[PDB]
Design an enzyme around this catalytic site. Structure first.
Site, PDB file in Angstrom:
ATOM      1  N   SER B 197       9.881   1.605   6.124  1.00 29.72           N
ATOM      2  CA  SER B 197       9.169   0.358   6.395  1.00 29.72           C
ATOM      3  C   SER B 197      10.196  -0.789   6.605  1.00 29.72           C
ATOM      4  O   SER B 197      11.014  -0.722   7.530  1.00 29.72           O
ATOM      5  CB  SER B 197       8.188   0.076   5.242  1.00 29.72           C
ATOM      6  OG  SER B 197       7.282  -0.968   5.577  1.00 29.72           O
ATOM      7  N   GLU B 324      -0.861   4.664   8.415  1.00 26.55           N
ATOM      8  CA  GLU B 324      -0.014   3.545   8.036  1.00 26.55           C
ATOM      9  C   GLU B 324      -0.777   2.270   7.672  1.00 26.55           C
ATOM     10  O   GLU B 324      -0.337   1.508   6.815  1.00 26.55           O
ATOM     11  CB  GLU B 324       0.967   3.241   9.175  1.00 26.55           C
ATOM     12  CG  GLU B 324       1.814   4.439   9.622  1.00 26.55           C
ATOM     13  CD  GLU B 324       2.983   4.715   8.695  1.00 26.55           C
ATOM     14  OE1 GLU B 324       2.901   4.377   7.489  1.00 26.55           O
ATOM     15  OE2 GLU B 324       3.986   5.282   9.171  1.00 26.55           O
ATOM     16  N   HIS B 437       1.065   4.574   3.912  1.00 29.67           N
ATOM     17  CA  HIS B 437       2.366   3.977   4.198  1.00 29.67           C
ATOM     18  C   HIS B 437       3.195   4.116   2.920  1.00 29.67           C
ATOM     19  O   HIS B 437       2.778   3.661   1.856  1.00 29.67           O
ATOM     20  CB  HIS B 437       2.181   2.480   4.503  1.00 29.67           C
ATOM     21  CG  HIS B 437       3.382   1.811   5.094  1.00 29.67           C
ATOM     22  ND1 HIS B 437       3.939   2.208   6.297  1.00 29.67           N
ATOM     23  CD2 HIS B 437       4.071   0.706   4.711  1.00 29.67           C
ATOM     24  CE1 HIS B 437       4.904   1.369   6.630  1.00 29.67           C
ATOM     25  NE2 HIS B 437       5.007   0.448   5.690  1.00 29.67           N
TER      26      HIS B 437
HETATM   27  C1  LIG Z   1       5.633  -3.779   5.273  1.00 26.05           C
HETATM   28  O1  LIG Z   1       5.247  -2.685   4.440  1.00 26.05           O
HETATM   29  C2  LIG Z   1       5.022  -3.022   3.109  1.00 26.05           C
HETATM   30  C3  LIG Z   1       4.561  -4.311   2.730  1.00 26.05           C
HETATM   31  C4  LIG Z   1       4.235  -4.581   1.387  1.00 26.05           C
HETATM   32  C5  LIG Z   1       4.356  -3.577   0.396  1.00 26.05           C
HETATM   33  C6  LIG Z   1       4.839  -2.297   0.799  1.00 26.05           C
HETATM   34  C7  LIG Z   1       5.170  -2.017   2.127  1.00 26.05           C
HETATM   35  O2  LIG Z   1       5.587  -0.718   2.258  1.00 26.05           O
HETATM   36  C8  LIG Z   1       5.103  -0.026   1.055  1.00 26.05           C
HETATM   37  C9  LIG Z   1       6.138   1.103   0.677  1.00 26.05           C
HETATM   38  C10 LIG Z   1       7.540   0.521   0.380  1.00 26.05           C
HETATM   39  O3  LIG Z   1       8.148  -0.025   1.557  1.00 26.05           O
HETATM   40  C11 LIG Z   1       7.443  -0.592  -0.673  1.00 26.05           C
HETATM   41  C12 LIG Z   1       6.319  -1.349  -0.835  1.00 26.05           C
HETATM   42  C13 LIG Z   1       4.977  -1.172  -0.041  1.00 26.05           C
HETATM   43  C14 LIG Z   1       3.881  -0.683  -1.021  1.00 26.05           C
HETATM   44  C15 LIG Z   1       3.579  -1.718  -2.149  1.00 26.05           C
HETATM   45  N1  LIG Z   1       2.937  -2.925  -1.594  1.00 26.05           N
HETATM   46  C16 LIG Z   1       1.703  -2.598  -0.799  1.00 26.05           C
HETATM   47  C17 LIG Z   1       0.722  -3.772  -0.630  1.00 26.05           C
HETATM   48  C18 LIG Z   1       0.976  -4.478   0.692  1.00 26.05           C
HETATM   49  C19 LIG Z   1      -0.270  -5.194   1.233  1.00 26.05           C
HETATM   50  C20 LIG Z   1      -0.638  -6.481   0.486  1.00 26.05           C
HETATM   51  C21 LIG Z   1       0.443  -7.549   0.620  1.00 26.05           C
HETATM   52  N2  LIG Z   1      -0.071  -8.845   0.127  1.00 26.05           N
HETATM   53  C22 LIG Z   1      -0.495  -9.820   0.981  1.00 26.05           C
HETATM   54  O4  LIG Z   1      -0.586  -9.680   2.204  1.00 26.05           O
HETATM   55  C23 LIG Z   1      -0.784 -11.041   0.274  1.00 26.05           C
HETATM   56  C24 LIG Z   1      -1.222 -12.286   0.780  1.00 26.05           C
HETATM   57  C25 LIG Z   1      -1.338 -13.412  -0.063  1.00 26.05           C
HETATM   58  C26 LIG Z   1      -1.016 -13.307  -1.429  1.00 26.05           C
HETATM   59  C27 LIG Z   1      -0.584 -12.071  -1.944  1.00 26.05           C
HETATM   60  C28 LIG Z   1      -0.475 -10.953  -1.099  1.00 26.05           C
HETATM   61  S1  LIG Z   1      -0.072  -9.256  -1.412  1.00 26.05           S
HETATM   62  O5  LIG Z   1       1.216  -8.896  -2.102  1.00 26.05           O
HETATM   63  O6  LIG Z   1      -1.202  -8.540  -2.099  1.00 26.05           O
HETATM   64  C29 LIG Z   1       3.875  -3.946  -1.024  1.00 26.05           C
END
Ligand SMILES: COc1ccc2c3c1O[C@H]1C[C@@H](O)C=C[C@@]31CCN(CCCCCCN1C(=O)c3ccccc3S1(=O)=O)C2
Ligand SMILES: COc1ccc2c3c1O[C@H]1C[C@@H](O)C=C[C@@]31CCN(CCCCCCN1C(=O)c3ccccc3S1(=O)=O)C2
Ligand SMILES: *[C@@H]1O[C@H](CO)[C@@H](O[C@@H]2O[C@H](CO)[C@@H](O)[C@H](O)[C@H]2NC(C)=O)[C@H](O)[C@H]1NC(C)=O
Ligand SMILES: *[C@@H]1O[C@H](CO)[C@@H](O[C@@H]2O[C@H](CO)[C@@H](O)[C@H](O)[C@H]2NC(C)=O)[C@H](O)[C@H]1NC(C)=O
Ligand SMILES: *[C@@H]1O[C@H](CO)[C@@H](O)[C@H](O)[C@H]1NC(C)=O
Ligand SMILES: *[C@@H]1O[C@H](CO)[C@@H](O)[C@H](O)[C@H]1NC(C)=O
Lengths: 532, 532
Positions: B197, B324, B437
């Protein structure tokens, strides 16, 4: 005598015609308007003055002046569409087939021929009404109307060449049928108009036009819809084409009066010889002189009329053929030929797309290409060929009809939709063209019941079924036999959108005919073209 | 002693760690840069000053300051990604696993963690390098780098916060590995960088950046590509977000100097608390502080670098997972929940599309919706849910990687592409999310070989195969064992575009991974958005 009928226009004498070991009466070449010749060329039709004595209606009339197909001399596939009687501007006549003995008050069907608004004849062998009239016991009428510049040259604002006169020719024939069919045993309260392609578009136009609505009861549209992209033009485009025609004939273009007078001095063939030079784009499935959105025959845009329910509310039965686009790709798209399998290269595919959607910008062309290309196998010649066949058919016939069907059903009183996909065993066109535009007509007119024509026993059965569906619908507003055991053609509704296939296999019902592609053609592409 | 290594930066003492009934050496928490604290926050990293004595490298280091996921407290699916050591800005350390006995000159693999550039740790249990180092006999290194504002706040034109410093942190670690890995038995001539990623995007960025190219030999990219829509921003957008962060903290915005000084006085958590407020659109799969196209680390636009072959030419092995997009829809799109099957209504589908392509105008949104809607069954909840999953994955991960892959292969020296589609038997996330993902990582790192983790015997076999493919590729530039009898992973070429599925079933080769959708995302949509 059975062959003598007195009408409000005068006496008419028909002829007895043999039909499948029996006989019926035919009244051929009955005039319904004054010949639109000389200073009347381009003008609205005038009703035929009543005559003394008896009009001889024993033989077919002349066909209207038109471009004649010479792409395949002697080939029956193309020549079965060409005029088979001498051409003349004196061509406003109608034909009537009457069961014998003469009925008292039976179902009436009026046929309106197609031909892209630039050609067509009511006298073609595929339009012989004796089989349908005999088999279904209906009074069958086939009308005629001016085509090409003679019927659609349009200089809006002028009364000498207002446009849409070919449609008014059809209307005048429908008025004559309404006023006189009772004398031939027909019931004026139960008249069904039906036509194919430009004739199907015409039928839909009479459904829309306030001045035509009261002249018939129900309607059947085959492979044609009033909103087809090729079926009408704006008054500005109509004017530009009329002026361009004049420019091709070295006319004085200073005024409508000067232009029209010049166009009127020309012999028919002089207009026909340059007719195709006025198109605004390099294209296929586009014709020069067609109906114009004039604000009179058509009160407002077709789309606003359809959206507001500004049209005759009644029952309609309509449908399309599987490969509507093949005829047009054969005649103009690079890579297609009558005697080859026509496998299309990626580049000819691109060229075809450009010819098929002439009004599209580059983004539009890309949208269409993407939508019809299998990117996992883009150099597949058969897939490129079939994809183009679908592009042409979906854009010009199927999706416009599906848009018409859905808009109509919201206000109408009954819709029956079909998908004709049977390739005739004796078709002379190559296999790649499939179920061609116009080839369900022979089944509608009962040709397969004629042994010498070489159809299979199942094709004769298919013809009989279709003929009885059409006639029963003309009679009742429902193609299904009441209290029958046969499979039922279900009603097309806004919610379920059911339709049936029409072929030699046991009936099968489906839903949302080509929805994927039609959302593209009816909603997305015009939004894209309007934004970019 | 085996646990003592003298490097150009000073002596380091590791620890013996047990691994699958055996043992290996681990040198954890080796510093490669001066702590980027105080006045050095936002600044390019400075190399770590050499130290006297022996550095104790027996325990993991602190994790960098970052937003911490609290969506599912106690849930292992989400917490396995959260920092598992105390957070601190003093976090620039690397970890090394060395086979025992110490090798002389063996294959080296350097892992770059992901986390959307705003989170991530080198110390997570799924990144434990002992299994891979032990099983494949490679020296395994995992580096670290600043994330969020600390690593990517960008005020272009300023030397105090130039942007891309997190990437420079990675580069500095690669420089340390190049300069010192030989003392741990690694061969500096054979270093493979790999990441998933944001880590995979990072790897591609080092391939592109002139200043990083010489530091490694080959590369592996998992579910990430340098050109991903979320992986970089322009200097203008980077500046706007930095200013907006300042505005959220009531900073003086008169000058970069005033802004940066203010941002430097804030405690780490104060920046993190408002970090998400700077996004320009309501969206999913978009992160605040990421790499900037600065004209320095990246000479010109990524697309022009890719088109002109302005990048390191070598071998690459890369691929994507089947679903993904699910992780991101669960966290932000209406209708999705962790404990339901998440069947999506037509309206939530529409809302999801808008969040997924935040930069699109209405025509663009319609194009996407049409492309992913089955209009024959549009109210199907499972189809709407899966369609959105594909929209998110295709747009953000798969199609950008496929564009990178095709552009790269034209100039590169060897490409191997995979499609990982095995759903782990012990996955704690719901079934609707599929092959998530990040979930191929546990197979790459050999977790299935650990009995207590409850994987099936075939999953352990899959892990062993993947690990040997990765390591053999790191070693030779080809994942296939020379002279082996096993099925061969074929080379991805410009012409055939072959790739293999990666799962517990016998290998299967395919071609043109998701071409239909990727032509839409990589060619048509940007053309549409640029025209309208
Ligand atoms: C670009 O790829 C990714 C983007 C974010 C993350 C990962 C990731 O790839 C995966 C596998 C590895 O590389 C590590 C972390 C991973 C899994 C854990 N987590 C997954 C949750 C991500 C989706 C939610 C992100 N959030 C927001 O979009 C948001 C908006 C406003 C306030 C807070 C938040 S959030 O942290 O909940 C964070
Ligand atoms: C709108 O639907 C149609 C348009 C044109 C025609 C028919 C038709 O529907 C069918 C069935 C029935 O309704 C009657 C005629 C049918 C079949 C016979 N023919 C088929 C050939 C049509 C395609 C070629 C038309 N031509 C041109 O586009 C062109 C351009 C420049 C010069 C000459 C020509 S052309 O006449 O060869 C003419
Ligand atoms: C076609 O029109 C007829 C008559 O307007 C409809 O039949 C009427 O249906 C309403 C509502 O169900 C009843 O209240 C009337 O008693 C019916 N009238 C008669 C004389 O039958 C018929 O339903 C319409 N068909 C369609 C498909 O729209
Ligand atoms: C990777 O690069 C090597 C070396 O540049 C390529 O091998 C050469 O291939 C050319 C053309 O076939 C030969 O003339 C040379 O003799 C080869 N050199 C060596 C040392 O083997 C190799 O083909 C490239 N691989 C790919 C997939 O691009
Ligand atoms: C009717 O007109 C046709 C015209 O050719 C002619 O052949 C036929 O004999 C005529 N019949 C009568 C009674 O006039
Ligand atoms: C190394 O540092 C860790 C820090 O907690 C400590 O527990 C360990 O005993 C130390 N070993 C030596 C020899 O300093």
């Amino acid at each position: 005598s059975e062959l003598l009928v007195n009408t409000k226009s005068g006496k008419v004498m028909g002829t007895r015609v043999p039909v499948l070991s029996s006989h019926i009466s035919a009244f051929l070449g009955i005039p319904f308007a004054e010949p639109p010749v000389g200073n009347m060329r381009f003008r609205r039709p005038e009703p035929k003055k009543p005559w003394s004595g008896v009009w001889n209606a024993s033989t077919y009339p002349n066909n209207c002046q038109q471009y004649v197909d010479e792409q395949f001399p002697g080939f029956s596939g193309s020549e079965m569409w060409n005029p088979n009687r001498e051409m003349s501007e004196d061509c406003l006549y109608l034909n009537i087939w009457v069961p014998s003995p003469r009925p008292k008050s039976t179902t009436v069907m009026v046929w309106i021929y197609g031909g892209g608004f630039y050609s067509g004849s009511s006298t073609l062998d595929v339009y012989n009404g004796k089989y349908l009239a005999y088999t279904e016991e209906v009074v069958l009428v086939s009308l005629s109307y001016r085509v090409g510049a003679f019927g659609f040259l349009a200089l809006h604002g002028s009364q000498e060449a207002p446009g849409n006169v070919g449609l008014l020719d059809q209307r005048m024939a429908l008025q004559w049928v309404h006023d006189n069919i009772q004398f031939f045993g027909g019931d004026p309260k139960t008249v069904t108009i039906f036509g194919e392609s430009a004739g199907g578009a015409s039928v839909g136009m009479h459904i829309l036009s306030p001045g035509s609505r009261d002249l018939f009861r129900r309607a059947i549209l085959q492979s044609g819809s009033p909103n087809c992209p090729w079926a009408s033009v704006s008054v500005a485009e109509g004017r530009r084409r009329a002026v361009e025609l004049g420019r091709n004939l070295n006319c004085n273009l200073n005024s409508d009066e000067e232009l029209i007078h010049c166009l009127r001095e020309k012999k028919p063939q002089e207009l026909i010889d340059v007719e195709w030079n006025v198109l605004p784009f390099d294209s296929i499935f586009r014709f020069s002189f067609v109906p114009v959105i004039d604000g009179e025959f058509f009160p407002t845009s077709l789309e606003s009329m359809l959206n507001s329910g500004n049209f005759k509310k009644t029952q309609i039965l309509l449908g399309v053929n599987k490969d509507e686009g093949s005829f047009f790709l054969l005649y103009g798209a690079p890579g297609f030929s009558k005697d080859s399998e026509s496998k299309i290269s990626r580049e000819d595919f691109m060229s075809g797309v450009k010819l098929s959607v002439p009004h599209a910008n580059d983004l539009g062309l890309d949208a269409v290409t993407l939508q019809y290309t299998d990117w996992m196998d883009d150099n597949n010649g058969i897939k490129n060929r079939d994809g183009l066949d679908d592009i042409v058919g979906d854009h010009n016939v199927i999706c416009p009809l599906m848009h018409f069907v859905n808009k109509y059903t919201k206000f109408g009183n009954g819709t029956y939709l079909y998908f004709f996909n049977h390739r005739a065993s004796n078709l002379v066109w190559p296999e790649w063209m499939g179920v061609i535009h116009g080839y369900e007509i022979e089944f509608v007119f009962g040709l397969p019941l004629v042994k010498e024509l070489n159809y299979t026993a199942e094709e004769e059965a298919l013809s009989r079924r279709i003929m009885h569906y059409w006639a029963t619908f003309a009679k009742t507003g429902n193609p299904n036999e009441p209290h029958s055991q046969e499979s039922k053609w279900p009603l097309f509704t806004t919610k379920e959108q059911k339709f049936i296939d029409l072929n030699t296999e046991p009936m099968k019902v489906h839903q949302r005919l080509r929805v994927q592609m039609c959302v593209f053609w009816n909603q997305f592409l015009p939004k894209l073209l309007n934004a970019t």
